[PDB]
Amino acid sequence: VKPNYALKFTLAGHTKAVSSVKFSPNGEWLASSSADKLIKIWGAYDGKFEKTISGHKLGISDVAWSSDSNLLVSASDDKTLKIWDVSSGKCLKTLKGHSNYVFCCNFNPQSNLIVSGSFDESVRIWDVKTGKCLKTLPAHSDPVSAVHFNRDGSLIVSSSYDGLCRIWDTASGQCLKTLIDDDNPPVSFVKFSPNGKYILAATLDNTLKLWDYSKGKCLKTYTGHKNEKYCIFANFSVTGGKWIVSGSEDNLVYIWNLQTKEIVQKLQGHTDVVISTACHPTENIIASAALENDKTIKLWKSDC
Ligand SMILES: CN1CCN(c2ccc([N+](=O)[O-])cc2Nc2nccc3ccccc23)CC1
Ligand SMILES: O=C(O)c1c(O)c(NS(=O)(=O)c2cc(Br)ccc2O)cc(C2CC2)c1F
Known about the structure:
By secondary structure, this protein is mainly β. Helices cover 0% and strands 52% of the residues. Strands 1-28-27-26 form a four-stranded antiparallel sheet, with no helix packed on it. The protein has a four-stranded antiparallel sheet with strand order 2-3-4-5, with no helix packed on it. Strands 6-7-8-9 form a four-stranded antiparallel sheet, with no helix packed on it.
């Protein structure tokens, strides 16, 4: 019926705003990125600091894991993405091509491709092995806030301040669908649902929406949080009860019932905007991260 997330660890170390936290697919690690130009690795279960990964010349907006939990990609204000070997901390490739800040990144399930989105209004598809750009998609007419592959990597979804969500065919780069609302507020986050059927989209009018993309119909709306300024990540919680999880500009983590849309928990503790949340792949564990009045990551655990 309702979760009971309680605070287990506060992870200190970043010296500026923390922008993104991600659990490794095998559940072992949490990776964090920050405006301090650093990536940090932490134990997912004991919160123990593991290592700092350094090399970007400016701040980092996003990080993402390969499917074997061995590689990381990061997206930076220095206009590059970097591919990292987590075990060695070494930069394997620097992905060059974007003409402005890179805001978002993800591997496909095979992890032979990386997708990125940028202030430069493009979505790029990269070959992991060579580090070369395979395709540049003229995806949007304002900064791209999020990019995500579906279950098998055959589709990409992108979101933008231009107010649009777009679905792309990975192999051809052609646009398969454009989702439009009405009053087109900036779309600040998007991701495919666990079953690949739906898309979860945030707009900067304090609203999360679950869309059936093949029918182009909104199925659920989640409200009550604050989101009018920052691109705040959202998640599906798949380990216990079926929840939607998001940060909020009132410094709280919000948790909603997937089907009824009622708020079932609000997690208090952070002292700045909670810009990023992540849900552990097997354990009812949430990671949250906040902006520069806070600079910490928090790990929470629920019985359901
Ligand atoms: C995981 N997310 C984090 C937010 N990302 C993002 C998206 C659009 C814009 N944009 O359009 O400006 C900026 C950012 N980055 C940051 N936004 C706010 C505060 C930040 C603080 C430090 C580093 C990056 C920050 C996308 C991926
Ligand atoms: O009762 C359900 O199992 C169910 C459902 O599984 C999906 N699929 S999902 O991909 O959003 C999803 C979300 C989560 Br959290 C976990 C798994 C998952 O598969 C959607 C809906 C309603 C909202 C439309 C459901 F009621």
